[PDB]
Amino acid sequence: GDNPCAAGPPVDTNPAECCPKPMLVDGTIMMDCYKKYGEQTKKQLQMDGIPRGCCIAECAMNATNMYADGMLKRDDLSKMFMDAVKDKPEWMSLVRDATNACFELAEKKMDEIEAGAKLEPSFEGEKICHPISGTILRCMGMMMFAQCPASVFNVNENCNKLREYGSICPMI
Amino acid sequence: GDNPCAAGPPVDTNPAECCPKPMLVDGTIMMDCYKKYGEQTKKQLQMDGIPRGCCIAECAMNATNMYADGMLKRDDLSKMFMDAVKDKPEWMSLVRDATNACFELAEKKMDEIEAGAKLEPSFEGEKICHPISGTILRCMGMMMFAQCPASVFNVNENCNKLREYGSICPMI
């Protein structure tokens, strides 16, 4: 009632069911990528200090031949993204916008990412990946929840409470 | 296991319990502003067309003498934000950046923001707000969840899976 942000989220609500977000990179690559590098990233998530590069993310960008020499091909990556939504126009609008946001926003933490990229394995079999991918690939993902197309959003008592929670509460 | 983003989040996990995010605007002001314009804002989420301005935010930006003539006082707001977290240096780093991100992201969607300010009330008794207030503060609100200091975050099974969820699932 009075305190919605006390309550927390709606219980059995899946944001992908509330919002059918598209593949900017093929869904089966990430399943593969996660299963490969999921266990490590979940550790690295709980580490302090300089943030460690997300290996799922570099593994995915490698596969699509977008990453090379510490470099993600922004130029090539965009169109790669533009092509996914050739089939869903309501998303075309968002993705274009989100791209330069993610990239130019990534430009702010260049010095921290540059630091993140130089690190050595925290234990046996830790793969040190360049964090740039995971910036962009997380950034893009978070971005697509945030401005879900009014045309694609799944509306219901739950998903409404869900959109309502996430929309109002962060500032509350 | 393999698909964590299938399972969804844990149900009884508060993102603010996992991260006791600071009040940059008095926690009780938002209660009032929410209590006043809450029903109205929850409608506008479901409305189409040009995005409608968040009034809670505008009301809060008013009360703290930050909103005036359709213009948010960037300088004073900047300064107001430090004053909240002067007592939490672990947040200062974050707060400064989030300030400039939120503003500069708002710089991107200006022509879209401008349209929202010109709209006409959809019926009897709609109060129309400038979307800038709700823009910056929603941006601001999500950011500190997003960059919750490893020093501030509560470590436990839930809060850890939760973090694990939010970092990895958006990109899947």
Q: Please provide the DSSP assignment of chain A as one string.
A: ---HHHH-S-TT--HHHHS----SS-HHHHHHHHHHHHHHHHHHTT--SSPPPPHHHHHHHHHTT-EETTEE-HHHHHHHHHHHGGG-HHHHHHHHHHHHHHHHHHTTTHHHHHHHTT---SSTT-----THHHHHHHHHHHHHHHT--TTTPPPSHHHHHHHHHHHHGGG-
Every domain of chain A and the residues it spans: 1-172
- Distances in Å between the Cα of B22 and the Cα atoms of A168, A169, B26, B97, B144 are 16, 13, 9, 15, 9
Method underlying the structure: X-ray
Contact state of B14 with A35 under an 8 Å Cβ cutoff: no
Location of structure tokens 């929670």: A165
Whether the CB-CB separation of A59 and A98 falls below 8 Å is answered with no
B165, closest residue in chain A (CA to CA): A42
**Which residues partner with B71 through β-bridges?**
B68
Q: Rounded CA gap, B131 and B144, in Å?
A: 21
Tell whether A50 lies on the interface with B, counting CB pairs under 8 A.
no
Whether the CB-CB separation of B162 and B5 falls below 8 Å is answered with no
Contact list in A for residue B168 (CB cut-off 8 A) is 34, 38, 41-42, 54, 56
Instruction: Indicate the angle between helix axes B55-63 and B131-146, nearest 10 degrees.
Output: 90
CB nearest A108 (choices: B25, B97, B134): B97
Location of structure tokens 């505008």: B58
Residues 6+ apart with CB under 8 A from B161: B4, B10
Fold of A1-172: Recoverin; domain 1 (1.10.238)
Structure tokens at A86: 């050739």
Structure tokens at A109: 């933490």
Contact state of B150 with A108 under an 8 Å Cβ cutoff: no
- The distance of A168 to chain B (nearest Cα, Å) reads 7
Tell whether B34 lies on the interface with A, counting CB pairs under 8 A.
yes
- The distance of A69 to chain B (nearest Cα, Å) reads 22
B55, closest residue in chain A (CA to CA): A168
Q: Rounded CA gap, B83 and B20, in Å?
A: 17
Gyration radius from chain A CA atoms:
18
Contact list in B for residue A142 (CB cut-off 8 A) is 146, 170
| Parallel, antiparallel or unpaired: strands B71-72 and B67-68 | antiparallel
B156, closest residue in chain A (CA to CA): A46
Contact state of A12 with B9 under an 8 Å Cβ cutoff: no
B143, closest residue in chain A (CA to CA): A170
Tell whether B168 lies on the interface with A, counting CB pairs under 8 A.
yes
- The distance of A125 to chain B (nearest Cα, Å) reads 20
Q: How far apart are the first and last CA of chain B?
A: 14
Tell whether A93 lies on the interface with B, counting CB pairs under 8 A.
no
Q: Rounded CA gap, A70 and A58, in Å?
A: 10
B65 torsion bin: left (phi>0), alpha (psi -120 to 50), beta (else): left
A100, closest residue in chain B (CA to CA): B108
What stretch of H or E contains B8?
none
Tell whether B88 lies on the interface with A, counting CB pairs under 8 A.
no
Contact state of B8 with A30 under an 8 Å Cβ cutoff: no
Q: Rounded CA gap, A61 and B31, in Å?
A: 44
Q: Which of B131, B115, B75, B98 is nearest to B24 (CA)?
A: B98
Q: Rounded CA gap, A79 and B145, in Å?
A: 31
Contact state of B164 with A42 under an 8 Å Cβ cutoff: yes
